[model samples]
Target: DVASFATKLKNTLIQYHSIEEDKWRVAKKTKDVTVWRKPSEEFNGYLYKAQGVIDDLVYSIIDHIRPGPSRLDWDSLMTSLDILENFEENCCVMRYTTAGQLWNIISPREFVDFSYTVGYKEGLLSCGISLDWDEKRPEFVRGYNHPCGWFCVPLKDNPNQSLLTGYIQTDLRGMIPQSAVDTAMASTLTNFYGDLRKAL
Candidate 1:
């Protein structure tokens, strides 16, 4: 089971990296941000992309999202983030507690999985999915359809600035309607970029 989960994680990251980002639909656009999403039954949920130019170094952006205390400053939806396993500084398994909102009901959701592995190529790369290592945490509700990652491409013209991009694929579970689900996806993309920009 562990081997299969590991293989799936690797292959999914490869497939995500292979997606030609040029064709992603402009789901929402504003002067300061651009959000994209591609829906496919093959993916079983929407593949999201949020892009913005952040006025910070690539590593600065990485440091903010690389599973630590600084995340609390940017991740508004997160009620809690705890590192469960640290393989190294940039790689770890973590648990996240989020406040869920759909309709008028307020619920708390918890997610436990391996955080995205941060690395570099043309710029900075971080990608992964939530995997269960069969740990029992009875206090939290699990999340689903949440395959997410990001790529930060540094601009050639600006050494101090970098292009910030983010990704997420989630199935908003429960009895929530499709319209609400669509709205949730669009707003989340907007907030991701807008919040990061505000942070820098």
Candidate 2:
């Protein structure tokens, strides 16, 4: 069942990547990264894509972003990570918590997700979708991620450089303004590249 779930996620990531370029609106752009958003059919929120080229090998980039100790050390937004179950080397269930945004107006949130990583064209796809867990932490709001993934592939022209693209659609379930959510999503995505580049 986990393998089948992973297969579904992989297909979803490929489909999201194949969406028409014109359908995605620019949400934020910097010298290094470009973030785009489109209406999400899966949830009452926008689906976001952040694309950038990292000056590192595909494997190295994947290792940093996948649910691991390195990710906890580098990703500023993520405050904590714990592996709840490991079905395989490339599939698992993990619980992670994120830092509050917008001056604590958006309280810290937690998520339990089924994470999967597998080979894509010539690189790797790391993706996850939230799963219902019985235990809920009282200190953090439980947010749901509809479907999200990161595709890291080496450029044909330069194998040393990787083109990293991410799809994120998180339902920050709580009382928060839509405007604040938009601002936070765009800025958070834009900052993600900065943090990752610096770490690499």
Candidate 3:
């Protein structure tokens, strides 16, 4: 159990960690873009490519990896691990799939850092989910549809912070138009436990 948990937690952290980076990059990039509401060309305004930001994070992780495993040994280990377990179909979609909300909530990076700050100071609390190995629990951007692994807090009640959605919540939430909270929250709720279907 220790080894299994460690491996899963480690791999999970690596994936989520990058997601945070991308969120910041996107926010920073959007602000820096020079092609927007030029109120008068004096300063114009700013650009925000929500979709572009979302796709980059998900696709980069799900689609491919480069430089031959130097970035993270998990890429290499997983390849052989799959062969050993005869995983058959490509599971490369695992990370992108889990953090499916690749587009949901804004960058958690925008929220907090090592401590429980004011803004991020909503959602659940990872105060107890610390695994040292399970760094994702504390460091990753958790939401409603998140893994029970990181489900340190309750749902619904706007816990000082906000929702704790998973990868699916992250993606579908954005796909749905606004004025559709009933749909977003419901879809988000379903996605949180949709994996149950895979189990049966």
Candidate 4:
């Protein structure tokens, strides 16, 4: 079931990346990264798309972004990570916790997701979907991610530089205001690129 789900998620992310540019509304833009959003059919909030070119190889970018030790060290939002199960070299179940945002108003949250990484085009596609894991920690709120993924590919002219794009739709299940959620999501994504670039 996870294999099929991974394939479906891969297809969905590829489709999301291929959608017409005009269809997506720009949410945030910095010197290096631009974040776009469109109303998601799967969830009430928007599906965010972040695109930027990292000054690194495709393999290096994928290694840092995937659920691993590197991510836990560099991704500031992630507080901790643990691999719960491994189905294959590129497929597994992982549990991770995130730091609180909006001055802790969002609070710390936990996620257990089925993660998959595979070759896409000349690079890598790393994707995940939150699972309905019953073992909940009382200290952290449970957040559900609805089919999110990142697509990183090498630029044709420059294999040393990679173009990184991501699709994220997280259901932060709490009583927080929609405006706060919107602000946090957009800012978080923009900051993600900065953090990754610095780490690399």
Across 1-200, the per-residue lDDT of candidate 2 in tens digits comes to 78888899889989998999999998888888899999998987899999999999988998988988999899999999999999965999999999999999899999999999899999999999999999978999999998899999998789999999999999989999999999888877877788889999
Better-scoring candidate (lDDT), 1 or 4 = 4
- Looking at model 2, residue 158 earns an lDDT score of 94
Error of 2 at 34 (Å): 0.5
- Alpha carbon deviation, residue 30, candidate 4 (Å): 1.0
The lDDT of each candidate is 0.69, 0.91, 0.24, 0.90
Give the higher-TM-score candidate: 1 or 3: 1
Better of 3 and 4 by TM-score: 4
lDDT of 1 by residue, 61-92 (tens): 87776677887679777778888876643567
Task: Please identify model 3 stretches exceeding 4 Å from their true place.
Answer: 1-7, 14-18, 21-162, 168-200
Model 2 stretches with alpha carbons more than 4 Å out: none
How many residue pairs clash (N, CA or C atoms closer than 3 angstroms) in each of the candidate models, in the order given? 0, 0, 17, 0
TM-score of 1: 0.82
Which stretch of 10 consecutive residues in model 2 shows the poorest summed lDDT? Answer: 186-195
Q: Write the per-residue lDDT of candidate 3 for residues 55-117, one digit (tens) a residue.
A: 122223222221123212332112211111111212111221122222544322111111110
Task: For residues 11-82, write the lDDT of model 4, one tens digit per residue.
Answer: 988888788999999988888899999999888888999999999998889899888899999999999999
- The estimated TM-scores of all candidates read 0.82, 0.97, 0.19, 0.97
194, model 1: CA deviation in Å? Answer: 2.1
Number of residue pairs clashing in candidate 3, backbone atoms closer than 3 angstroms, sequence gap of 3 or more or interchain? 17
Better of 2 and 4 by lDDT: 2
